[PDB]
From a paper:
If this were the case, then the Cep152 (1273–1295) region could substitute the packing interface observed in the Cep63 (440–490) crystal structure.
Using multidisciplinary approaches, we showed that two long coiled-coil proteins, Cep63 and Cep152, form a heterotetrameric building block that undergoes a stepwise formation into higher molecular weight complexes, ultimately generating a cylindrical architecture around a centriole. Notably, the N-terminus of Cep63 (i.e., the mCherry fluorescence of Cep63) was detected in the innermost region (231 ± 23 nm in diameter), whereas the N-terminus of Cep152 (i.e., the mGFP fluorescence of Cep152) was positioned at the outermost region (350 ± 23 nm in diameter). These observations agree with the previously proposed model that Cep63 and Cep152 generate an antiparallel 2:2 heterotetrameric complex arranged around a centriole in the Cep152 N-terminus-outward fashion.
Author numbering:
A (entry chain C), E (entry chain E): -5 to -1, 440 to 485
B (entry chain B): -4 to -1, 440 to 487
C (entry chain A): -5 to -1, 440 to 487
D (entry chain F): -4 to -1, 440 to 486
F (entry chain D): -4 to -1, 440 to 485
Write the structure that this text describes.
């Protein structure tokens, strides 16, 4: 019906909210790890150089 | 040490959000499962009272 | 004052936000009953028809 | 079981929303009750000072 | 580098909206403490006048 | 007394909000902290490469 339909379009949209905020957390996480990897990679470049 | 506390806090927060998205799917799916039983139960009724 | 009538607005908007979320939680829970109750009734009909009543 | 455990999860989240709406109404009521007796006191000061 | 910068702003937005809520709560605690102090001011005035 | 716990329940919610605002700044800080160390390291690689 109509009262039922408007409940599905909210429950679906409320879901992708939680599925969006989980992606934004994933965005922060493996962007920290990306900077972590560049840091080690640049550190080892420096080390291999002075060696 | 202090870097991998925030890192643990984020993943714990990320998982907390993931469960919410899954809790919504089980409610949105169990709804869809129940109406499917209606359409399949009401059809049984119609077929049955077509026979008499 | 006016700040005191800006905070009352913020509260009564915050409050109506909470009342609405509790209402949405009901219709989901209420509809999950009207559908579950309908299936017992629909099942009780399929039975009553096969028995020939 | 799958269906009736999520119903708990739903009811517990509903009351977790009602409890919030009650906590807000408690602030809005108690902050008006304060505002009320202040006028009720402000009048006694005026009534007393007039005689 | 660029998708990164949309995340920095999202983190900044959530930070401000958290500071806004911390300030909004402060006004709730401040107006309450302001009101009970006006009571004691008005209540003790009535008492002085009543003597 | 009924007034009392509300003021603590309200102050506690203020602390929960203050804490979240701090945690967001950490991520903003340690992010900007890492991108600074990564530029500083990148400069060392340039200077040393001669």
């Amino acid at each position: 019906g109509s009262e039922f339909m408007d409940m599905e379009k909210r429950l679906r949209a409320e879901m992708q909210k939680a599925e969006d905020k989980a992606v934004e957390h994933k965005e922060i996480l493996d962007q920290l790890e990306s900077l972590k990897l560049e840091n080690r990679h640049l550190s080892e470049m420096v080390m291999k150089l002075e060696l």
